[PDB]
Subunit: 217 residues, 5 copies
């Protein structure tokens, strides 16, 4: 109790101590480079197709974007910190990848708190939920065959030389798709793509999110 109550205060200063050694000694990660490239794992959880505007060809999605990477600058051994194997931290305190939708028509709106989980192996998990408006012609949404749209996500300023992407599966997580949406999902896939762009030798990597959908009935 008084024992147990001291364990609590102790655990705190341990975390504060770790958060001090990490977030100062070697400062912020300066981003990846070709010498030390970074692999970012990307995955999508589709919650809702909120709106499909046929007068402007924009469709609004609500989804969670799963992001994972690993950095040696964020390694520590849980034995020098009271067995702290991980912590929560504000996402501003750390480097996060500049993953963007390439055909959005409005700035993304964030729906969850901007907080990541860092693990002692220097791995990071960050899952921002957002609402995205993107370019999409919903022709066919009101037929049996439905409509099909696609939006690519990838780094804005880092090529495949500095940032590699991967998905753990090519199936979009549909386990949280809102059952009463105006639209039913016929299928949703997320697929790693590599292209070259004539100019420049460097490759470009994106995860393409394709979605086929129709009015609910």
């Amino acid at each position: 109790d008084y024992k147990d109550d001291d364990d609590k205060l102790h655990s705190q200063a341990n975390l504060m101590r770790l958060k001090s050694d990490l977030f100062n000694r070697s400062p912020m990660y300066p981003g990846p480079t070709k010498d030390d490239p970074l692999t970012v794992t990307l995955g999508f959880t589709l919650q809702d197709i909120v709106k499909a505007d046929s007068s402007t060809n924009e469709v609004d999605l609500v989804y969670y974007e799963q992001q994972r990477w690993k950095l040696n600058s964020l390694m520590w051994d849980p034995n020098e910190y009271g067995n702290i194997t991980d912590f929560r931290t504000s996402a501003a305190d750390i480097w996060t990848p500049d993953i963007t939708a390439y055909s959005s028509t409005r700035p993304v709106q964030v729906l969850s708190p901007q907080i990541a989980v860092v693990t002692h192996d220097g791995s990071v998990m960050f899952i921002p939920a957002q609402r995205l408006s993107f370019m999409c012609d919903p022709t066919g949404v009101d037929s049996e065959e439905g409509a099909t749209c696609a939006v690519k996500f990838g780094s804005w300023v880092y090529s495949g030389f500095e940032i590699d992407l991967k998905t753990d599966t090519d199936q979009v997580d549909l386990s949280s798709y809102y059952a009463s949406s105006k639209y039913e999902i016929l299928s949703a896939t997320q697929t790693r793509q590599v292209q070259h762009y004539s100019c420049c030798p460097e490759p470009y990597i994106d995860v393409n999110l394709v979605v086929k959908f129709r009015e609910r009935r």
Copy 2:
């Protein structure tokens, strides 16, 4: 008089002791789990959109939790037993609607009450848009919608939730609302998701309502 100046210095010194010569509490952990009490006061169903299945709520969200690191002896500070402070000065939980469709809009001052036993009360007023099919809203039966609230980043082993009651407080509901409320419940739930190893805790808010004639 030369009394109000003393009490003022006592408050200033108290806040200063708590925030400036001691770090912010880093949040809960497996070894230092936090229980957060939630209670909802529904003020208005402002709008129901059948074209996109979004409904807009205005409500007050009552949050309470208790930290050892915020405790003090009133006797060491001129008998002060509680004070107001900007929510930015302290740790606050990351309670989120899980089916919102727009960033939540805050309607009240971001200020919390801290009490000498280390308890905190924080009650943000909010407008929320969330996923809801209002089909049936123009019948006698009405429409029923649901929205979960819980931590985004902390499992049940770090943040636990409780309610004091399972009835949503309807005593402030706007009488001339376009919608009347048939019932409104807040219910703690523990659920396992494939994404994560640990059970997560939410409070489910289910509202039955209909067009007011």
Copy 3:
């Protein structure tokens, strides 16, 4: 001539430095040190009355006045400066909130207060507010009636008390070509007990009766 202006600038930089730095920001009112805030509304316009959501949009000026010993000074010690203008963020401001707004209040004017050597502050932000209102009858002769309470969010009547100078809302800047004409507008102090709290809260209740301008 020109030397004078420099001096007074120095005097003002000095007064402000003394007030803001030789003692922190006043921590807010307590049960020991309660504050009375005086409120007056100037109704500029009813902009929108949406009957599909029961929301009415108002534009108004909100006069706020209060007074602190901690903002007092001797003008003789400061080149006879009797008052000054300063940013609302340099000072404590009351957390006065509309209890039935439906969207965050939008600020229309610069956030600047006037402090006076007697310790009194005046701060008049212009605002557009959406709040809960049933405009039914706005096309009738008697018109429509709405009410919205203003008061502190976090301070009870033991810490903050409100007051009006009149129960009459100032309509002298009401936009003469508004869609709506004002039949009456009142602002009245109320002592309210809510079942959520053992302490009474004080609010100013803004009652507006209005109808479509013909």
Copy 4:
């Protein structure tokens, strides 16, 4: 080559070290000159009596605390700085219905003689009955601009002319301009004994043929 080191030094001299000006006072009043360049009447709403304008708002004033000698800082006659680095007047539309939207970078020009020029491009919604806009007579609206917290004893207004500059008015606008005037107006009230000043922007306009 060194001229970049002179700019740095000047900006440092004027800001860093120099006790930077606390705004105007009765003992030290300020004259702000105001001029509008009307770009477009974008929207006219008969259901809420709101009209939206896009314009450029030119503001000029002058401070001793910002004067310097050119050949004492390597012949520098002027510089650009962020609006946040310096003091700016609190000119506002007295009958807006929505917060103003800023359309231009918030950067001002400072000259060695201590003058500042600031020209924020803005979209403004304000109270206006557009009745008659589809007539030949047209519609008439007005909005006053001026300080919110400084009377005429602390800030005086001027204008270099009472004609609104229309040389950048949008040639294919929904609405054509019949007249646009910007008029200085001294105002004495009643609650108060000090004078007040505003610049009244009157626009007459109608739907384009």
Copy 5:
């Protein structure tokens, strides 16, 4: 080793951004040339009730500074790096006829190279003044919007385009509008108000409802 490349950059950035106080901006004595290019992604919306058209595009900005160059061998063969656009000076290029504030679609990060050149490419959504009369015809509709520095005259900032053709190779295939032509063209003139020369890049786009 992989440890070491990282330390070099960190050191390199610190050298540029601490002992080297950033560029206070251009002057009549040392003017700056900024290269502009538009990649037109989509005409989202054409409002004939207010005469506003909404575009989504990428705006390619390129310029060059002595204060930003370095020798890659004094730093471990680092030839470029990325950095928050807030950490450096950027040009205040603005649409001159926008009706609403521009909305930023992409992260605000620039690429700086060892020769001192910078590339910054913000994706944007822009509403601007445009009477879309005839958008529903064979001829289609024509609109223009000028871009340029707000506070720097032709004496301080010069503008150049790479080519006169707007890049259309990323135009949305299923847009509500098809592009008939898109040009970007440097213009210089005097205005009556002022005596300095003014430079802008004028974006002209002809388009029509997709058939």
